[PDB]
Design a protein around this ligand. Structure first.
Ligand SMILES: *[C@@H]1O[C@H](CO)[C@@H](O[C@@H]2O[C@H](CO)[C@@H](O)[C@H](O)[C@H]2NC(C)=O)[C@H](O)[C@H]1NC(C)=O
Lengths: 49, 46, 29
């Protein structure tokens, strides 16, 4: 759970670059696939188990 | 035979349509997971 | 990729299909 974003999956270092106001990203078909850690400000991918 | 390459490079619509049509149906299936269908919400955590 | 949706690979690889077509081509010529 990332400040409201509830989900399940494996967290890994990403290679995306958000804009300096965006918290999380979605893929095509509108499903969350990356988030930013509120504390460390790093982008992490979310892959299904 | 040397002209075939021009006719194809400038054609594979029958193969592209079947791949694209199936992908559009699969994406349409996923887009149904964000509808209420006559409920208070679409999210089980609510 | 997602929730409960998967894609199964074909039994025949693209290399195996090329082998079938080269055998037909070598036979007829
Ligand atoms: C939230 O608080 C933590 C500390 O609890 C902050 O962590 C600091 O981060 C900076 C780099 O941005 C480091 O140089 C400090 O050493 C960190 N402090 C500690 C105690 O580890 C964090 O930056 C804060 N987040 C925000 C957005 O302000």
């Amino acid at each position: 759970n990332f400040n409201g974003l509830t989900g399940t999956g494996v967290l890994t270092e990403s290679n995306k670059k958000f804009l300096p106001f965006q918290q999380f990203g979605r893929d095509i078909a509108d499903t969350t696939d990356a988030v930013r850690d509120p504390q460390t400000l790093e982008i992490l991918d979310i892959t299904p188990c | 035979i040397g002209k075939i390459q021009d006719s194809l490079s400038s054609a594979l619509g029958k193969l592209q349509d079947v791949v694209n049509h199936n992908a559009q149906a699969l994406n349409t299936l996923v887009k149904q997971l964000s509808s209420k269908f006559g409920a208070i919400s679409s999210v089980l955590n609510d | 990729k997602f929730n409960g949706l998967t894609v199964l690979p074909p039994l025949l690889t693209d290399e195996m299909i090329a082998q079938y077509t080269s055998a037909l081509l070598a036979g007829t010529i």
